């Protein structure tokens, strides 16, 4: 059945960040000595994962309590566990975790492994006991208190017998990337042995798939089953558990991103580069290499997006006259004047329309001026700004600092118009050129024979205040 423990008290958790972890084999092919660009669900590089200690001591006395809160599930979960006594045992998945909706269950029962999908009646605090005493023969007698009952189960599984917990720093890492797509339960998994650690360390480990489960249920929330080393009837304070819950687990949530994976000759994924993390990483992804030489490279195109859409049909009459809400100017918006649709910034114009004219076209391809139906103020439209983005870098293996040149635009509009990496536009390092706006480089009055040609008589170079400087080229 079920047993009620004490309240979780909503403890404020520490956080840690996963330095380049949790990339798995996306496809089912064998690729050797290739650099492949894969767009799929991955855990972002250098992302914050939240880590729970298995058993926390709210006081050093021995006041020990579980940390197994229910957590969301949006398009996959990277779950790592660092532990040495199989204190974590499995997971439940579902939407409501009650009798209303189907629920899936993976758990290690002592020695066997059982997977089910039923209408389990999960209570609030599932736990698996394993206590011992020297007298008689107990040696982890156990209690299995996960679900009250199960009805008309569809998927069944059991495995074979095995071993249990111990009645010492070789903590093992176990990583899983549970994702549910197309009514499946892709469980990418990998075990590794590590020693002399306290948290999850920086490292790289490609994860290989383990099993696909044909399940086909709606999944939104999941929990974690923890092995208890005690008994609620006679709960001990200290040394009852495993060193005050040093074993712990980390949760992070996948996002749809593009990665550059480096398959070595053997077909084993060795390195990865996250495109959307840095300007330098986008340069690597566009050049399809892990090292880039000195120069400037055009990565992508920056375009101002229309903020809000406005309409302006109101002729005033006949048929059904409509309304236009309001009118906004000096702002890049989507506009529909009497059915003429487009995007642009509307501004007050000094052109003088003849009384019988509606719109003008000085360029012969685009109507640069328009007459407003409500008030006869004549508005000229200008296309929202855009331009290429060039990444100025010295040698990739000299330094990882780069500068960014937005070509052919003023940069009173760069930080907000575009939505990846963020600039924050420090006041001193947004030097303006004729060729565009420069971000991440300072100004130097001195002149040198110019290394990297930026344009309009400005060239940039590297000096050990940002490491990259821009100056006006000298002729000798």
């Amino acid at each position, epitope marked *: 059945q079920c047993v009620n423990l004490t309240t979780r008290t909503q403890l404020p958790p520490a956080y840690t960040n996963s330095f380049t972890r949790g990339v798995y084999y996306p496809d089912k092919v064998f690729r050797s000595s290739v650099l492949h660009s894969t767009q799929d669900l991955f855990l972002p590089f250098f992302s914050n994962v939240t880590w729970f200690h298995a058993i926390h001591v709210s006081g050093t006395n021995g006041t020990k309590r579980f940390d197994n809160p229910v957590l969301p599930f949006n398009d996959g979960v990277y779950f790592a566990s660092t532990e040495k006594s199989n204190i974590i045992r499995g997971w439940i998945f579902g939407t409501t975790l009650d009798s209303k909706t189907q629920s899936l269950l993976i758990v290690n029962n002592a020695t066997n492994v059982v997977i089910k999908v039923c209408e389990f009646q999960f209570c609030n605090d599932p736990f698996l006991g394993v206590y011992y005493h020297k007298n008689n023969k107990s040696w982890m007698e156990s209690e299995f208190r996960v679900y009250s009952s199960a009805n008309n189960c569809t998927f069944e599984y059991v495995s074979q017998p095995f071993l249990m917990d111990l009645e010492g720093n070789f903590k093992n890492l176990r990583e899983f990337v549970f994702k549910n797509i197309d009514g499946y339960f892709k469980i990418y998994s990998k075990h590794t042995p590590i020693n002399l650690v306290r948290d999850l360390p920086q490292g790289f480990s490609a994860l290989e798939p383990l099993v696909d489960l044909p399940i086909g249920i709606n999944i939104t929330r999941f929990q974690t089953l923890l092995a208890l080393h005690r008994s609620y009837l006679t709960p001990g304070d200290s040394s009852s558990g495993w060193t005050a819950g040093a074993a712990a687990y980390y949760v992070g949530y996948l996002q749809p991103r593009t990665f550059l994976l480096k398959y070595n000759e053997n077909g084993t994924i060795t390195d990865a580069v996250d495109c959307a993390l840095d300007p330098l990483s986008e340069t690597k992804c566009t050049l399809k290499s892990f090292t880039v030489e000195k120069g400037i490279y055009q990565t992508s195109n920056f375009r101002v997006q229309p903020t809000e859409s406005i309409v302006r049909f109101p002729n*005033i009459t006949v048929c059904g006259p409509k309304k236009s809400t309001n009118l906004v100017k000096n702002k890049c918006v989507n506009f529909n004047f009497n059915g003429l649709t487009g995007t642009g910034v509307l501004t007050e114009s000094n052109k*003088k*329309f*003849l*009384p*019988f004219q509606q719109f003008g076209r000085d360029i012969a391809d685009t109507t640069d001026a328009v007459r407003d*139906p409500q*008030t*006869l103020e004549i508005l000229d439209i200008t296309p929202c700004s855009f331009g290429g983005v060039s990444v100025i870098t010295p040698g990739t293996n000299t330094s990882n600092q780069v500068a960014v040149l937005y070509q052919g635009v003023n940069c009173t509009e760069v930080p907000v118009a575009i939505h990846t990496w963020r600039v924050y536009s420090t006041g001193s390092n947004v030097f303006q050129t004729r060729a565009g706006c420069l971000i991440g480089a300072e100004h130097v009055n001195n002149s040198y024979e110019c290394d990297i040609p930026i344009g309009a008589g400005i060239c940039a170079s590297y000096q050990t205040s940002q490491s990259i400087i821009a100056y006006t080229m000298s002729l000798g």
Partner: nanobody
Amino acid sequence: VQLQESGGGLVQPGGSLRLSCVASGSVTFNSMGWYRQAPGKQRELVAQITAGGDTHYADSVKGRFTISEHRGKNAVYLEMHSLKPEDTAVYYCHLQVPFLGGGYDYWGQGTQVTVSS
């Protein structure tokens, strides 16, 4: 279409307002007219300004309405003041564009104004 003219606020007796003819561009004229009409009765001639400067006014609007022109923005203004409930109507401004000697004035664009307590 040609020109356009609308807008204006409701007022109470004794109030003041300055009706303005929306600047529609440069147009040839010799007499800017202001008519007033309310449901149940005909359009009536209220205020006329000639390009030379002649100021024709109805007997019912003497000493309360002032008509003027501004050629910088090419708009004729009618300042209406000392208002009474008899001014509850729509006001129409008619242009002067010569046609075949003169015709098709442009009063079609109007503004609704009601003077009540």
